[PDB]
Design an enzyme around this catalytic site. Structure first.
Site, PDB file in Angstrom:
ATOM      1  N   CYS A  46      -0.591  -7.246   7.610  1.00  0.00           N
ATOM      2  CA  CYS A  46       0.839  -7.387   6.892  1.00  0.00           C
ATOM      3  C   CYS A  46       1.526  -5.810   7.085  1.00  0.00           C
ATOM      4  O   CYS A  46       1.187  -4.878   7.385  1.00  0.00           O
ATOM      5  CB  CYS A  46       0.353  -7.173   5.492  1.00  0.00           C
ATOM      6  SG  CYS A  46       1.450  -7.356   4.255  1.00  0.00           S
ATOM      7  N   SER A  48       3.078  -4.240   5.093  1.00  0.00           N
ATOM      8  CA  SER A  48       2.661  -3.233   4.244  1.00  0.00           C
ATOM      9  C   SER A  48       1.684  -2.249   4.981  1.00  0.00           C
ATOM     10  O   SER A  48       1.455  -0.956   4.598  1.00  0.00           O
ATOM     11  CB  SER A  48       2.146  -3.535   2.605  1.00  0.00           C
ATOM     12  OG  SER A  48       3.201  -3.716   2.109  1.00  0.00           O
ATOM     13  N   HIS A  51       3.475   0.050   7.077  1.00  0.00           N
ATOM     14  CA  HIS A  51       4.156   1.182   6.280  1.00  0.00           C
ATOM     15  C   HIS A  51       3.196   2.380   6.128  1.00  0.00           C
ATOM     16  O   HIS A  51       3.890   3.528   6.064  1.00  0.00           O
ATOM     17  CB  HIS A  51       4.632   0.597   4.990  1.00  0.00           C
ATOM     18  CG  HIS A  51       5.909  -0.430   5.043  1.00  0.00           C
ATOM     19  ND1 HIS A  51       6.059  -1.367   4.094  1.00  0.00           N
ATOM     20  CD2 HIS A  51       6.554  -0.747   6.257  1.00  0.00           C
ATOM     21  CE1 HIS A  51       7.054  -2.046   4.515  1.00  0.00           C
ATOM     22  NE2 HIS A  51       7.416  -1.902   5.678  1.00  0.00           N
ATOM     23  N   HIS A  67      -5.608  -4.895   3.695  1.00  0.00           N
ATOM     24  CA  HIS A  67      -5.592  -5.498   2.191  1.00  0.00           C
ATOM     25  C   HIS A  67      -5.600  -7.010   2.030  1.00  0.00           C
ATOM     26  O   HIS A  67      -5.523  -7.425   0.953  1.00  0.00           O
ATOM     27  CB  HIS A  67      -4.438  -4.729   1.420  1.00  0.00           C
ATOM     28  CG  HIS A  67      -3.129  -5.336   1.840  1.00  0.00           C
ATOM     29  ND1 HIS A  67      -2.646  -4.586   2.870  1.00  0.00           N
ATOM     30  CD2 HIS A  67      -2.253  -6.096   1.276  1.00  0.00           C
ATOM     31  CE1 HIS A  67      -1.192  -4.965   3.191  1.00  0.00           C
ATOM     32  NE2 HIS A  67      -1.063  -5.909   2.185  1.00  0.00           N
ATOM     33  N   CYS A 174      -2.716 -11.630   0.604  1.00  0.00           N
ATOM     34  CA  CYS A 174      -1.488 -11.162   0.412  1.00  0.00           C
ATOM     35  C   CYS A 174      -0.244 -12.000   0.660  1.00  0.00           C
ATOM     36  O   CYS A 174       0.464 -12.378  -0.392  1.00  0.00           O
ATOM     37  CB  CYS A 174      -1.205  -9.867   1.125  1.00  0.00           C
ATOM     38  SG  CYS A 174       0.208  -8.983   0.777  1.00  0.00           S
TER      39      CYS A 174
HETATM   40  C1  0BP Z   1       1.207  -3.498  -1.248  1.00  0.00           C
HETATM   41  C2  0BP Z   1       2.417  -3.646  -1.557  1.00  0.00           C
HETATM   42  C3  0BP Z   1       3.523  -4.620  -1.253  1.00  0.00           C
HETATM   43  C4  0BP Z   1       2.943  -5.538  -0.271  1.00  0.00           C
HETATM   44  C5  0BP Z   1       3.819  -6.760   0.135  1.00  0.00           C
HETATM   45  C6  0BP Z   1       5.107  -6.961  -0.025  1.00  0.00           C
HETATM   46  C7  0BP Z   1       5.811  -7.979   0.340  1.00  0.00           C
HETATM   47  C8  0BP Z   1       5.376  -8.728   1.496  1.00  0.00           C
HETATM   48  C9  0BP Z   1       3.751  -8.631   1.750  1.00  0.00           C
HETATM   49  N1  0BP Z   1       3.165  -7.562   1.125  1.00  0.00           N
HETATM   50  N2  0BP Z   1       1.497  -5.486   0.236  1.00  0.00           N
HETATM   51  C10 0BP Z   1       0.854  -4.810  -0.161  1.00  0.00           C
HETATM   52 ZN    ZN Z   2       0.830  -7.142   1.807  1.00  0.00          ZN
END
Ligand code: 0BP
Ligand code: ZN
Ligand code: 0BP
Ligand code: ZN
Ligand code: ZN
Ligand code: ZN
Lengths: 374, 374
Positions: A46, A48, A51, A67, A174
């Site tokens: 993902c 995130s 990040h 996650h 997610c």
């Molecule tokens: C923690 C926080 C936000 C997100 C998220 C937000 C938009 C799209 C996908 N994942 N994932 C983990």
């Molecule tokens: Zn995510």
């Protein structure tokens, strides 16, 4: 047979920011009271998770990130009632303790037991189940799915259909749920409505799917990359628009196209300008705009409050609005009952050991979703 | 007896920006098809009428302004079905044509026949019923209530209880409905909730009244002027807070006070900083903030979209969310059935000819509402 003992296994540890993941031998402690040890079967990559690599999602390092995942329960600590050795499970990066005023609230899902707001990178008890050659390694969002084995708090796990294909339903951890919920749950898209979706990666495709499930009459896909359009139409978009094709601003184009503004718009890319755009293109009196993605290193956006004074509604959510433990199993049930297909989102599948390759596909824009298999 | 003929009467004409109103003899044309001529009995002075004077509410000049009022129908043009000579009426600055997609929409009230978005300062037919010594004078929001007599389009008027005290129920033409609706209609305040109201002038007091009617358990009044607090508590506020008393930012104070954020917050003052404040002080997962006032010469505000990504909902409306013609009569019925009192909002009453005095009271902060009597 491994129950109650340390498991030696491989995980993808990020020792420092801006570095590739290192596949390391780690030790995974047995689960304490109200903890659950899971053998991972699949995990998606993902935005995130990246990040964390960039340093924009601040969380303690070294870390085992990941996650979005599914697997099989290896064992349970004292007092676990909701899952059993052998169960197919999805870790919940947003917990559902069921007790706090958020979990009590009929609309709220951002449980105050979360580790996103002020990350500690631990289990709920403030410790870590992970060592690498005796050094402690931090958890991530109480999940840490980039590991052959993980321990999660009971409030961060959900039992799913014993017959689910884990390699697919991992997306419900997610990316899918976030998109789909945004439509179906947060915005509550209505039948005959006109929707606009800014961003056609995996989470945007999932918004389109939720809008179609809700019975939207028009689903307008918006992206600067043309190559994204086929799959958008294939999953439910009626039309697609590239802003670079136009000489006028895109909210004007979309307002004209929808005869004075859309019913629901969705920002899924995470950019400040497109957020305001998305809000403006919705109908001034009864339009709703939903913020799905963010950049966790966010500046402020700049907007004119008159956009809201006419009657617009602006909102965001985490995890598609869904109360996580309540909803994850029904979403899997729905997939199992064929109410929606996940294969359109899966563009790449790699063994876990090629994680770094998968992130390259993500960083470059070449994949919609890479699934890693253990 | 005046039916079908020009009426010669007095009105308060603003010939130019940044000038006092001039009490002038004017002529008021008889109503054409689907138009209604009203003898005014009372009109409140609203902040928005002053925005016309400052030039911040751009609308054609010279103008007869005023939009919060009540009176008695003098006569009706061809085809008027909803009111009759003699009826007690409230002009509707937000029309309800009943046909457009906004009026069709079960949530929307900002009828597309409005003259606020792109003001023409006319009747719906693009002409004016007003002359001053043969010069044409512009209408304002299809109401123009600062005149002994006015003509409005049928879509801009509502028949009310033949027994209403017009000197009081005139507040339902703007100030009260706007506040009260914000709580009861836009935010949909729930029982046991904690509310925060930023600004305790007339429209803020009206939000407090709507929050109390909705059964809020806590209504926190916020204003920098202490003198405003008594009347806030008298109409339903549980506590009052002056930010100048504190050493820390007010959203932190309010988050602490409400054990992690309010259910509903309301910005009623129209300032960009307090708008963001109001949004931040609401609970991160399920908080709702409602924007009530604006400055029509508005810059952009600057906000962090993470405030929304946790689960907040940000929204505004015109006229309290209320579909105007549908709701105005029931609001008067409710007043008549004593479900709420309007006298707490009326601090000054002046004859119409002292309009300029009334605006001085408004500009200075000395009144909550001045009512002008014909
Ligand atoms: C923690 C926080 C936000 C997100 C998220 C937000 C938009 C799209 C996908 N994942 N994932 C983990
Ligand atoms: Zn995510
Ligand atoms: C409080 C807030 C807004 C307004 C308003 C807005 C537009 C036109 C007229 N009045 N009045 C009171
Ligand atoms: Zn909780
Ligand atoms: Zn209408
Ligand atoms: Zn007003």
């Amino acid at each position: 047979s491994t129950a109650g003992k340390v498991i030696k296994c491989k995980a993808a540890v990020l020792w420092e920011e801006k570095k590739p993941f290192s596949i390391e031998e780690v030790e995974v402690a047995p689960p304490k009271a109200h903890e659950v040890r899971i053998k991972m079967v699949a995990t998606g990559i993902c935005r995130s998770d990246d990040h964390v690599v960039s340093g924009t999602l601040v969380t303690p390092l070294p870390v085992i990130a990941g996650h979005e995942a599914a697997g099989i329960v290896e064992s349970i600590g004292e007092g676990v009632t909701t899952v059993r050795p052998g169960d197919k499970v999805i870790p919940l990066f947003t917990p559902q303790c069921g007790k706090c005023r958020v979990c009590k609230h009929p609309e709220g899902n951002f449980c105050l037991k979360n580790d996103l707001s002020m990350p500690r990178g631990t289990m709920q008890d403030g410790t870590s189940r992970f060592t690498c050659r005796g050094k402690p390694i931090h958890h991530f969002l109480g999940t840490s799915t980039f590991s052959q084995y993980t321990v999660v708090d009971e409030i961060s796990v959900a039992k799913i259909d014993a017959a689910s294909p884990l390699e697919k339903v991992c997306l419900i951890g997610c990316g899918f749920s976030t998109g789909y919920g945004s439509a179906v749950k947060v915005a509550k898209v209505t039948q005959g409505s006109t929707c606009a979706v800014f961003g056609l990666g995996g989470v945007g495709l999932s918004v389109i799917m939720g809008c179609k499930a809700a019975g939207a009459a028009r689903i307008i896909g918006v992206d600067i990359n043309k190559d994204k359009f086929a799959k958008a139409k294939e999953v439910g978009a009626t039309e697609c628009v590239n802003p670079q094709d136009y000489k006028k601003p895109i909210q004007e184009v979309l307002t004209e196209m929808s005869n004075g503004g859309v019913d629901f718009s969705f920002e899924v890319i995470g950019r400040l300008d497109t957020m305001v755009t998305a809000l403006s293109c919705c109908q001034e009196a009864y339009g709703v705009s939903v913020i799905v993605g963010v950049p966790p290193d966010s500046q402020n956006l700049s907007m004119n409050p008159m956009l809201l004074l006419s009657g617009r509604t602006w909102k965001g959510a985490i995890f598609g609005g869904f109360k996580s433990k309540d909803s994850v199993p029904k979403l899997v049930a729905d997939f199992m009952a064929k109410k929606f297909a996940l294969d359109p989102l899966i563009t790449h599948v790699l063994p876990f050991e090629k994680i770094n390759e998968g992130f390259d596909l993500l960083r470059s824009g070449e994949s919609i979703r890479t699934i890693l298999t253990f």
